[PDB]
Design a binder for these strands. Structure first.
Ligand SMILES: [Zn+2]
Ligand SMILES: [Zn+2]
Lengths: 148, 108, 85, 76, 94, 82, 99, 99, 83, 109, 93
DNA sequence: ATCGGATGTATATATCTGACACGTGCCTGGAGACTAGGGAGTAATCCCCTTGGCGGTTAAAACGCGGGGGACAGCGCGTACGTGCGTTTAAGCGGTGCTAGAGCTGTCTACGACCAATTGAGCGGCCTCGGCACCGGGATTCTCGAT
DNA sequence: ATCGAGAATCCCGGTGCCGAGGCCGCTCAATTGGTCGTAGACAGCTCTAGCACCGCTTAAACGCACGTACGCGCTGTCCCCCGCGTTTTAACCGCCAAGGGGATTACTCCCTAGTCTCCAGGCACGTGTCAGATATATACATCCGAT
C-alpha cells in the first residue's frame, strides 16, 4: 500500500546518487524482493571479493526492519555460514527514518571490522581476538576461491 | 522472529525473559506457565522502570546534579499523578516531602 | 515566516502532514506516522532518539497533541494538497 | 577408507579418510570438500559425541561406518 | 565464598543508560529500584494467579497478564503497558 | 532493663516533625498525645517483627523482618531490600 | 533596640527549611533505646541489626509526618491555626486507626 | 389550633426509626437504570443479573452511610450541627480516597 | 435505546434517609449534588473492574461473583452473595 | 488416636479434615502440605465460627426470635471488640447500623 | 447437573452444639459460609508466604500457628492457638 | 413548676403462608495400603557483625522572661432549612412471551512439562579517579520599625 | 502608600575524599535438543432466566406556605506560645576489644506425593408444618402550650 511509494522514492534516490562500492537492484518484477552486490573495502583483507545478498521487505515499511540474507557465503565473526547477520541497528534499534542505503553502509562497515560485544560465533571471535595472523591466513585463502 | 539467539534480544527488551520465566514457574503462582507470559511481564516491568527513570533524570537535571538520589525519585514519583496514584502506599527511604504550605498560614 | 513546501513535507512518509504533532525535540511529523510508530515501532522519535513516553502520556489525557496553529497555516497555504487527503 | 556421513538436510557424503587422521584433520577435510565449518560440526557415531582431541581410531570406526552430522546454528 | 544473590542492578543500569546517556545512579536509588520492581512483579503475578484460578484454569497465559495489568495500573499507564506488551509478544512470536 | 525512655523523644523533635508536616502554631498539650500514638505504632510494628524473627528460630531482628512487618500492614517500605 | 522578628515569621522559615531537606529528625540513641525497651518487653535477650532500627525510625518519621499533615488540615478546617489533641484524635478516628 | 412539632424532634424520631430498620433505602428501578447507563459506557449491550445489581446497591448504601457518619463527625467537630459539602470534602481527603 | 441523565433518579428524600441512617440531624441544601457526584465516581470505579472481569471470561452477562470480586479487590469485602 | 475412625472424629473436630487437606494441596499454596496443617486450620475455623454463632444466637434470643438473621450477625460482630477489629473492612448484606446518636444532637434540658 | 460444595451442614452442626434450639435462615448460612471461606483464604495465604519467606517448601503446623498469631487479635489468637494445639495433640494419638 | 391534650409508639391476639428442617437415592470424592526419594533435621565449623567501653567536643536541649497575636466567650441578625399539607408521578406487583446466552458434553490437536549437556551471562572482588561535600568570601534578598 | 539597617540566604571558587563505573576471574543455570501426557479450543446441544411488554394500584415524590433557630460576623478580653539569650547535658565520632550466633557443609532418615482399589458423606430433590409477617384493637411514653 503506502510502503511501495516509499520504496519507489528510496530507489529513485538510490539511482540518482548511487553510493560508491555498493550496488542494488530489483531481483524480480515484484517490488518487495531486492538483490544487492557488495565488494570489500580497500583497507580490509577481503580484496577482490564480490558478494551477492538478497533482501526481503516486510508487509509494512519502514516500521519493521527489512530481512536481509547472504545467498553467498562469508567467513566473518559476526555472520553465520547460512547468511544470518547480527547487526545492532538492523534489529535492536531499527528506526523508520533510516534508509536501506545506510543499512548497506553499515554492512560494509561491519565487513571492515567485527564487533567484540555481540559475536555471532564465539569461537571465531576468540580466534580474531587471540591474535591477528591465524585469522589472516584463513581469510586470505578464503577470499579468492569463493568470490571467484 | 528468527530463533537461535538469546530470548531477551528476540523481544527487543532488556530485562531477562528467562529469569522472569523461572520466577513465574517456581513462585507457586500456577501449575503451568505459558510461553508468552514472561515476555509480557518483562515488557511491562521495563516500561515502568524506564518511565520512572526518565522523570528521575529530569528532576536530577533540574537540581543541577548528575546523579540519581532518593530525593529525585521521590520528586519524580510524587509530582506526577498516575505514578502517585499507583505508588500511593509506599514510602521511599530518605525521600522527604514535597514543599507545600497552606495559603491560610501565609502572612497578610 | 513562510511554511514553504520542501521543509513542509513529513520526514517519514514523504507526504502532506495530517494533524501534525510537535515532539518535545521540536520534531514535526504527520499524525499517521506517529500513530504507526506507537503500535509498530520503538515509541521513541526516530531522528534524535529520545524517549517521549511521559510527554505523550501527559498530553493524550487532555488531547493536546495536535498543533492547531500549524494546521491552520497548512490549510490556508495548501488547500489543494489537503483536500486530496 | 570410505565412510558415510548423513546430515540434517538429507545429504549423504562419502569421505575417503584413514583412521590415522584425527578429528581436527577430518573436520578440515570435510570443510574443504563440503564447506561446513568444523566448529559447527558435531559428530555422532553409535549415538555418542566425538571429541576433537582424541583420534578417530579411538572410536574403533571401521570401513563404511555411519556418522551423523549436527549443525549448531547460533545467532539469528 | 558468599552465595550468589540475584538482583536487577545491571538491567536497571542498562535502561537508565538507554534513557539518559550521561546520568549516573547511586546505590540507594538502585535499592529503591529493585524494591519497586519486586513489588510490581509480586502484584502482577498474584493478580494473574487469582484471576486464572477464578476461571477454573491451570495456566497463566499472556491474557491473564494483560488483564492483571489492566486492573492494577491507572488509566493511561495501563493502556501504554498493554500496547508495549503487545509490542514485545508480537515481535517475539514472528 | 530500661525504664521511662519515651521521654527521649523530646519537644524539639516533635516540633521539627510538625514543621516538616507544615504547621505554624503548636499547642503545649500535644506532645504527650504524639508520644502516645508513636508508642502505639512502635508496639504494633515490633510485635509482628518479633513474631517473624521468632518463627525463623533466630535471635536477631534483621531488616527483612521489619520490612515484611510493614508490608503486612499496608505500609510498604522501599530502600532496605524487599 | 535589638532586632526581634515578629512572632510568626520564624515558623514559616523553619517550614521552608525542613520541607526542603531529607535528613532524619529524631535522635538516634534515644530512639534505639526506646525500640530496645519495647522489644525486651515483648521478648528477652534480643539483638538488632542497624538496618532494623533504621527502617523502624524511617517508618515512624513518615507516619508522624502524615499524621501532623492531617492534623493541620483538621485544624485549618476548624477555623483555627493552632493544632490541638482533639484534631489528632479526629484524624486518627476518620483514618480508621482507632474507631 | 393546629399542632406541629418543634423543628429537630421528628428528625430525631426519623433517625431512631431508620437506624433500627434494615431495608434498602434507594429505590430499585432508578438505581438499576443508573447502573446500566454507567456500564454501557465501557462496553456495549451488556446484560445484568439481578444479584449483581442487588450487591452493587448494597455496597452503595454501606459506603454512603459510612461517608455520612464521617461527615457528621466533622460537622460536630467544627462546632456546628449542619453538615456541608466542605465537610464531605475533608472527610474524603483524610481517608485518602481523593488525595 | 440509549439512556440519558438518570443520575437524577437518586432522589433528595433518598439522600435524606441515608443521612438519617448515618446519624445526621440537620442537612444543608448543597449536600445532594456532592452526594450524587461521589456516588457516580464510586459506581464508575466498581463497574469498570466488574466489566473487565466479565470481559476476560469471554462472557456477556456480569454476575454477582464478578461484582463481589471487584469489590473485594477494590478494598471493600462483601458478604452474603457467595464468595 | 485409634487410627480407625474418621479423621474429623479422630481429631474430635466437627469441621472436615479431608476437604481442608485437599483445598490446601490443590489451592496453589505450596508444593507440599504437612500432615497436621489441615487439623490446625479446621480447629481454628471451628473456634471462630462457634464464637460468632454463639454471639449471634445470644443476640437473637435477646430479641425474642428463634432464628438467626443477618441483622443479628451484624449486631454480634459490631458489639464485640475483637470480632469488630478482625472484620473491620467487611460489609454484611442487609446488616444495618448500630444505633447511636451523638451527645451534642440530643435536645437540651 | 453439577455439584457445588459448601460448609452448610458443618455450620449447622456447630450451631446445634452451641445452641440446641435456635435456627438459622438461608442468608445467614450464606454469610457464615463466605466468612469461613475468607478466613481460610487469609490463613492459607499467610502460611504460604511465611513458607516462601524462609526458603522452605512445606506447610506444617507451626506456619499455620504463626499465621494465626499474626492475623488474629490477642485473646482470639491465644484461644485459637490453644484449640489448634489441643486438636493436633489429640489427632496425633 | 405541672397540668391536659395529642401524637406516636408499645403491647396483646387471630391467621395463614412460604421457607426451613428433614427423609431419600447415589456417586464422586474421601479413605486405606505400599514405596521410593528428596526435603528437612542434626552436628561441627568459620568469621562476620553485634555488643560493651572510654575520651573529647560541641551541637543540641533545657530554663527563663517579655509580649503580641490568637482562642474563646458573648450579642445580634436574617436567612436558609425544617415541618406540614394538597397534588402530580412513577415505582411496585402480577402475569405472559421469547430467545440470547450460560452451561455441559465429545474430539483431538498443539502447547507445555522433563532430562542431559553445554557453555556464556551474570555475580564476587579490586581499583582508580571524578563528582559531590565542605569552607571561605561576597552579592542578593526578605523583614520591620518609622516615617 | 515608602527609606534603610540588621539579618538570612544564594553564587562562586578552591580543596579534598570515597564510592561507583569498569575490568577480571569464575561457577551455575539458561539454552537446545527431543519426547510424551493432557488442556483447552472448538462444535453442538440444552434449557434458564433476562429482557420486553401490558395493566392496576397507591406509596412515595413534589411544590408551596410559614415559622424559627443557628451560621456567621463582629467585638472584647486575657493568656499562653514564641522569639531570644544563657546554661547545662549527653549525642556523636573515633577507637579498641571480646564473643554470639548467622551462615555454611556433610550426613542421614523418614514424610509424603504418587498409584490403585473400595465404599459412604454429602448433594440434588422432594415434602411437611409452623414462625412469623400482617392485621386489629388497647395501653402507655413523650412532646408542646400554659400556667
Ligand atoms: Zn508522515
Ligand atoms: Zn527527536
Amino acid at each position: 500500500h503506502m510502503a511501495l511509494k516509499r520504496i519507489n522514492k528510496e530507489l529513485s534516490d538510490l539511482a540518482r546518487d548511487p553510493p560508491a562500492q555498493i550496488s542494488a537492484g530489483p531481483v524480480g518484477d515484484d517490488m518487495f524482493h531486492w538483490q544487492a552486490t557488495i565488494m570489500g573495502p580497500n583497507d580490509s583483507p577481503y580484496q577482490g571479493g564480490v558478494f551477492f545478498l538478497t533482501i526481503h521487505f516486510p508487509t509494512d515499511y519502514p516500521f519493521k526492519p527489512p530481512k536481509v540474507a547472504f545467498t553467498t557465503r562469508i567467513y566473518h565473526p559476526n555472520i553465520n555460514s547460512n547468511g544470518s547477520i547480527c547487526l545492532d541497528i538492523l534489529r535492536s534499534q531499527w528506526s523508520p527514518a533510516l534508509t536501506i542505503s545506510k543499512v548497506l553502509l553499515s554492512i560494509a562497515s561491519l565487513l571492515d571490522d567485527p564487533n567484540p560485544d555481540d559475536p555471532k560465533v564465539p569461537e571465531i571471535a576468540r580466534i580474531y581476538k587471540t591474535d591477528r595472523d591465524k585469522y589472516n591466513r584463513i581469510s586470505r585463502e578464503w577470499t579468492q576461491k569463493y568470490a571467484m | 522472529s528468527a530463533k537461535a539467539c538469546t530470548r531477551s534480544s528476540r523481544a527487543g527488551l532488556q530485562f531477562p525473559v528467562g529469569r522472569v520465566h523461572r520466577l513465574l514457574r517456581k513462585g507457586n503462582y500456577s501449575e503451568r506457565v505459558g510461553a508468552g507470559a514472561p515476555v509480557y511481564l518483562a515488557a511491562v516491568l521495563e516500561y515502568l522502570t524506564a518511565e520512572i527513570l526518565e522523570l528521575a533524570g529530569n528532576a536530577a537535571r533540574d537540581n543541577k546534579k548528575t546523579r540519581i538520589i532518593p530525593r529525585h525519585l521521590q520528586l519524580a514519583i510524587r509530582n506526577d499523578e498516575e505514578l502517585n496514584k499507583l505508588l500511593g502506599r509506599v514510602t521511599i527511604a530518605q525521600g522527604g516531602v514535597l514543599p507545600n504550605i497552606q495559603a491560610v498560614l501565609l502572612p497578610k | 515566516a513562510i511554511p514553504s513546501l520542501s521543509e513542509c513535507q513529513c520526514g517519514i512518509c514523504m507526504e502532506i502532514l495530517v494533524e501534525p504533532v510537535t515532539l518535545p525535540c521540536n520534531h514535526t511529523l504527520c499524525k499517521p506516522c506517529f500513530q504507526s510508530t506507537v503500535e509498530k515501532a520503538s515509541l521513541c522519535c526516530p531522528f534524535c532518539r529520545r524517549r517521549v513516553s511521559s510527554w505523550t502520556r501527559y498530553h493524550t489525557r487532555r488531547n493536546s497533541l495536535v498543533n492547531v496553529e500549524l494546521w491552520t497555516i497548512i490549510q490556508k497555504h495548501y488547500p489543494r494538497e489537503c483536500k486530496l487527503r | 577408507m570410505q565412510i558415510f556421513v548423513k546430515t540434517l538436510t538429507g545429504k549423504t557424503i562419502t569421505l575417503e579418510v584413514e583412521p590415522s587422521d584425527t578429528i581436527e584433520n577430518v573436520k578440515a577435510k570435510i570443510q574443504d570438500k563440503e564447506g561446513i565449518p568444523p566448529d559447527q560440526q558435531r559428530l555422532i557415531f553409535a549415538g555418542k559425541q566425538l571429541e576433537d582431541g582424541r583420534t578417530l581410531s579411538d572410536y574403533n570406526i571401521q570401513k563404511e561406518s555411519t556418522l551423523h552430522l549436527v549443525l549448531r546454528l547460533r545467532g539469528g | 565464598k558468599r552465595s550468589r544473590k540475584e538482583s536487577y542492578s545491571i538491567y536497571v543500569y542498562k535502561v537508565l543508560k538507554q534513557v539518559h546517556p550521561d546520568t549516573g545512579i547511586s546505590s540507594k536509588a538502585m535499592g529503591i529500584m529493585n524494591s519497586f520492581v519486586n513489588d510490581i512483579f509480586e502484584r502482577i503475578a498474584g493478580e494473574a494467579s487469582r484471576l486464572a484460578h477464578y476461571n477454573k484454569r491451570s495456566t497463566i497465559t499472556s491474557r491473564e497478564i494483560q488483564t492483571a495489568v489492566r486492573l492494577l495500573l491507572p488509566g493511561e499507564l495501563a493502556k501504554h503497558a498493554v500496547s508495549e506488551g503487545t509490542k514485545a509478544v508480537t515481535k517475539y512470536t514472528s | 532493663v530500661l525504664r521511662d525512655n519515651i521521654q527521649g523523644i523530646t519537644k524539639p523533635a516533635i516540633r521539627r516533625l510538625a514543621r516538616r508536616g507544615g504547621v505554624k502554631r503548636i499547642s503545649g498539650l500535644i506532645y504527650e498525645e504524639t508520644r502516645g500514638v508513636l508508642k502505639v505504632f512502635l508496639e504494633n510494628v515490633i510485635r509482628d517483627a518479633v513474631t517473624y524473627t521468632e518463627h525463623a528460630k533466630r535471635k536477631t531482628v534483621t531488616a527483612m523482618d521489619v520490612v515484611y512487618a510493614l508490608k503486612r500492614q499496608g505500609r510498604t517500605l522501599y530502600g532496605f531490600g524487599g | 533596640k535589638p532586632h526581634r522578628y515578629r512572632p510568626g515569621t520564624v515558623a514559616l522559615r523553619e517550614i521552608r527549611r525542613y520541607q526542603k531537606s531529607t535528613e532524619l529528625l529524631i535522635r538516634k540513641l534515644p530512639f534505639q533505646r526506646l525500640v530496645r525497651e519495647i522489644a525486651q518487653d515483648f521478648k528477652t535477650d534480643l539483638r538488632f541489626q542497624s538496618s532494623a532500627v533504621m527502617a523502624l525510625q524511617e517508618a515512624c518519621e513518615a507516619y508522624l509526618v502524615g499524621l501532623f499533615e492531617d492534623t493541620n488540615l483538621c485544624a485549618i478546617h476548624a477555623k483555627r491555626v493552632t493544632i490541638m489533641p482533639k484534631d489528632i484524635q479526629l484524624a486518627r478516628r476518620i483514618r480508621g486507626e482507632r474507631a
